[PDB]
UniProtKB/Swiss-Prot annotation:
Assembly and binders: Heterotetramer, composed of two GyrA and two GyrB chains. In the heterotetramer, GyrA contains the active site tyrosine that forms a transient covalent intermediate with the DNA, while GyrB binds cofactors and catalyzes ATP hydrolysis. Can form a 2:2 complex with toxin CcdB in which GyrA is inactive; rejuvenation of GyrA(2)CcdB(2) is effected by CcdA.
Gene, per the UniProt record: gyrA
Superkingdom, natural source: Bacteria
Signal peptide feature range: none
Note: When the enzyme transiently cleaves DNA a phosphotyrosine bond is formed between GyrA and DNA. In the presence of quinolones this intermediate can be trapped and is used as an indicator of drug toxicity. The enzyme-DNA intermediate is also the target of a number of topoisomerase poisons, including toxin CcdB.
Effect upon mutating A18S: In PPA-10; quinolone-resistant
Name the UniProt record assigns to this protein: DNA gyrase subunit A
Annotated source species: Escherichia coli (strain K12)
Shown segment, full-protein numbering: 50 to 98 of 875
Domain notes: An N-terminal fragment (residues 1-523) can be reconstituted with GyrB, but the complex no longer has negative supercoiling or ATP-independent DNA relaxation activities, although it is capable of DNA cleavage; ATP-dependent relaxation is inhibited by novobiocin and non-hydrolyzable ATP analogs. The fragment has ATP-dependent DNA relaxation and 30-fold improved decatenation activities, unlike holoenzyme it preferentially binds supercoiled DNA.
Family: Belongs to the type II topoisomerase GyrA/ParC subunit family.
Length: 49
DNA sequence: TTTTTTTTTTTTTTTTTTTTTTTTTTTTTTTTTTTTTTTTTTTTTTTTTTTTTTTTTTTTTTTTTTTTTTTTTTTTTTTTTTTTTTTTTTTTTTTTTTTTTTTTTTTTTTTTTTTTTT
């Protein structure tokens, strides 16, 4: 939801992971960074999903 | 106004314990030295027809010493018991998976101050 609200569309240019993690932690997820980034890393990598 | 009782932290330095620097013994690790395997070719060894004079088996008969034989008494064999080892259920502990809670370190760059050595 944070990546959709930011506008991280698949055909648009990339955005840094720090901005997305900061936006998620600031707005939606109250559980602090370094665990949202692990979920993002797992969702990105092709041998896990 | 002078004088009298009591209380504790310090002059403490010494005894006990703890912490921190040390170096003998069995378990790793790199080296040299000896067991394995594949090619060349090479004189050398070795596979297969022909002839040949040989020397051991099969007609026949003989005996004697190993094959018959019965029996006493041993002694290896088997029985029970118990110990030692092997092997497998049982239990315990530890590790990895993915979202969470927490933290912790090493260096550049300059300029100024402490803090030891000569």
């Amino acid at each position: 939801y944070a990546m959709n609200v930011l506008g991280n569309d698949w055909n648009k240019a990339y955005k840094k992971s720090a901005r997305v993690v900061g936006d998620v932690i600031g707005k939606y997820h109250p559980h602090g960074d370094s665990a949202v980034y692990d979920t993002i890393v797992r969702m990105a990598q092709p041998f896990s999903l």
